[PDB]
Amino acid sequence: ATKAVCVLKGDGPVQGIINFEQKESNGPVKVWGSIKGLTEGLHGFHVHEFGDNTAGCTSAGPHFNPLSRKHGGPKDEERHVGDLGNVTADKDGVADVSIEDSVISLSGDHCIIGRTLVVHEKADDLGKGGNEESTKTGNAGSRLACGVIGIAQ
Template sequence: MKTLATLAGLLALGFAADVIEKRSAYPFAGVYNPVYTVSFPHYLNPYFDTEESPSYNYNSRYNPYQVPTNYPGQPAPPYRPPVQYPPVPPPTAVAEIRSMGDVEGSDGVEGYITFTQTVNGIVLISGNVTGLTEGHHGFHIHDLGDTREGCKSMGPHFNPGLTHHGGPADPYRHVGDLGNIVAGSDGTAHIQESDHLITLTGPNSIVGRGIVVHANKDDFGRGGDKESLKTGNAGGRVACGVIGWAKPMPPIPHPQQKPESNES
């Protein structure tokens, strides 16, 4: 028993001496940051001389963005011009509009509609449709790109939000409600529009769906009847087409900079 007591006493004295030594090195209570030194290898050092033996500069910290300093007799580092990536073309889709014989007297309706998605998500709509009667014609994206039964098999308006029919500027509308196109006296409708709901990617993508030109004017759901809230009373389907991916338009070239004149 005395031996165990003696051993316990010696251990207690040793622990106390260790605590006293640590307190002398760290007089204040708390957690101290570890002190260590890191040396970078020579190939990470910006002052490394490839012609001589590896040299280190311990007086400055490594900065990956720092331009190396040229010592006397050391060749200048090779010039590396900044990498210029080519511009990414925007997603583009196109639909060929033509009559399917659903409306009598519409055999000559035809045209092309192009959809281009911009960086901010707005889709630009452009194209021409010829052979129409003069006036307004409903212009909608339909749910399906099926033409086995003509334009009739393209289904209802593209409406993933399950809302009522409306105009292109209404807060609640079918995604496919693009309003009207207007044909002149020559039967040609020139289309230059944009829309904030349809997209070429994501859940509101119109790629693979149908686009339909109707016989009558779209009343934007304000006709006061059920058909107005469903189709805008736009009437029969004069012509239609399937929207598919298209080759994007080439980017606009940058204007060439004129050389500065030395005239004073």
């Protein structure tokens, strides 16, 4: 099995820790952890291409998309590898994250180690927003916090 972890930080109050676990090659990756400081409600949650934080969350680039597809929800065939949808923050601003995805990977072609996880200002519209931006980012807006995905013990 392979394990990874990500510490999310930004310019505001949003911070979190997200874990990744993959038991087998090409198997599902469990993504779980907790993010605090969020507004109540849905927040876009994606793996962006670069593990580059030199200029903050902005230098992580766009969504991880080695297949050159359009943006969608995690359950869509047409989606970016990094499209993990939304996470939900409760009334106290805490998002308990628990997702399983088989499009991302911790090894191989869809590997996300060394890339950046980002949690967003707004909900990801899953490509259903009717504008050009919807099929790029889901209109999820600004990057509240991010971190580089690292190898875990």
